[PDB]
Amino acid sequence: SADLRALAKHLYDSYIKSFPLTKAKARAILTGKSPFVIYDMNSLMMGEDKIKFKHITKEVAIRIFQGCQFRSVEAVQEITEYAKSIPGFVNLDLNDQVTLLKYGVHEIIYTMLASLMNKDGVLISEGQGFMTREFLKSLRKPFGDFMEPKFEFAVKFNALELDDSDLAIFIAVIILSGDRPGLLNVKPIEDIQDNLLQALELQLKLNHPESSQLFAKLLQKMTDLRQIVTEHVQLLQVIKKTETMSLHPLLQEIYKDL
Amino acid sequence: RHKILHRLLQ
Ligand SMILES: CC[C@@H](NC(=O)c1ccc2c(c1)nc(C)n2Cc1ccc(Cl)c(Cl)c1)c1ccccc1
């Protein structure tokens, strides 16, 4: 009761310390020093510096792809510090921790990505940029459908009107998933997940007393996240067999045998 | 086996 409340506020505060761009901030921007808008080839060129990228120094779609890759490496880092905060996560065997994060991150990355999306585009560069859904759609095959499925999910997911104190627990539930392939000691993970799923349930009962069957609707979404990952991984296969394209080794470490 | 993830957890 008051335990599950104290755990809700714990994860919310960890979430805030761990992720610098929150749904609260993203929504303020999307409904507002406006973001630079990239809607076509020439606006991509004008706004290229908005796209955070650090390297030594070449097709338009590859640069977007690299950009998304660049930022995902950082999302992984963020999610990891967050997991380290979910009570008992650090106490699990250190090989399971790696597997939970391994399969957990894509699901989390796409859940939080929804926060930065509306039906027309996605925030980039900590809200400094806005790249339109239509622009991404126009990129030559197979990069034209790289983002589209993500936008399709986001719109559905955003209609749930979840806020940061809700996603904090939802995200912690996903990490502590009990059916991740190759898990050694499955029991302790599910104990905490059971304890987080009940915390989520109460959090949705108080914070959203009007929207009925949200908890229900929310667990259903958690099944589509996995579908979106599946499509993604399958699409990466195509790209990897036709392009000449390079993947960060933190990402390669996650995709290997996934 | 997953070196970067390990060092991120350490
Ligand atoms: C989980 C890894 C996976 N990441 C994504 O699918 C992805 C896509 C767009 C993202 C994202 C993660 N995070 C954010 C803020 N955005 C928005 C976004 C959209 C467009 C641009 Cl240009 C940028 Cl910089 C950011 C990946 C794997 C391999 C290759 C490229 C990606």
CATH number, domain with residue A249: 1.10.565.10
What is the residue-wise DSSP string for A225-258? HHHHHHHHHHHHHHHHTT------HHHHHHHTT-
Q: Is the CB of A123 under 6 A from ligand 1?
A: no
Residue A97 touches chain B, beta carbons under 8 Å: yes
Query: How far is the C-alpha of A162 from the C-alpha of A208, rounded, in Å?
Result: 9
Whether the Cβ atoms of residue A204 and residue A214 lie closer than 8 Å to each other: yes
Greatest Cα pair distance in chain A: 55
Binding positions of A for rosiglitazone are 69-72, 106, 232, 255
Residue B4: partners with Cβ closer than 8 Å, 6 or more residues away: A249, A250, A253
The span from the CA of A206 to the CA of A199, in Å, is 11
Amino acid (one-letter) located at A238: V
Measured by CA distance, the residue closest to atom 7 of ligand 1 is A68
Residue A54 token pair = 């650090």
Domain span at residue A17 reads: 1-258
Domain count, chain A: 1
Q: Are A235 and A142 in contact (CB under 8 A)?
A: yes
Please give the angle made by the CA atoms of A38, A43 and A48, to the nearest 5 degrees.
80
Residue A150 has which token pair?
């993500």
Closest listed residue to residue A27, CA positions, set A160, A164, A135, A209: A164
Structure tokens, A12: 């919310």
d(CA A214, CA A15): 21
B8 touches chain A (CB under 8 A): yes
Structure tokens at A14: 């960890």
The two structure tokens encoding residue A28: 């303020």
Structure solved via: X-ray
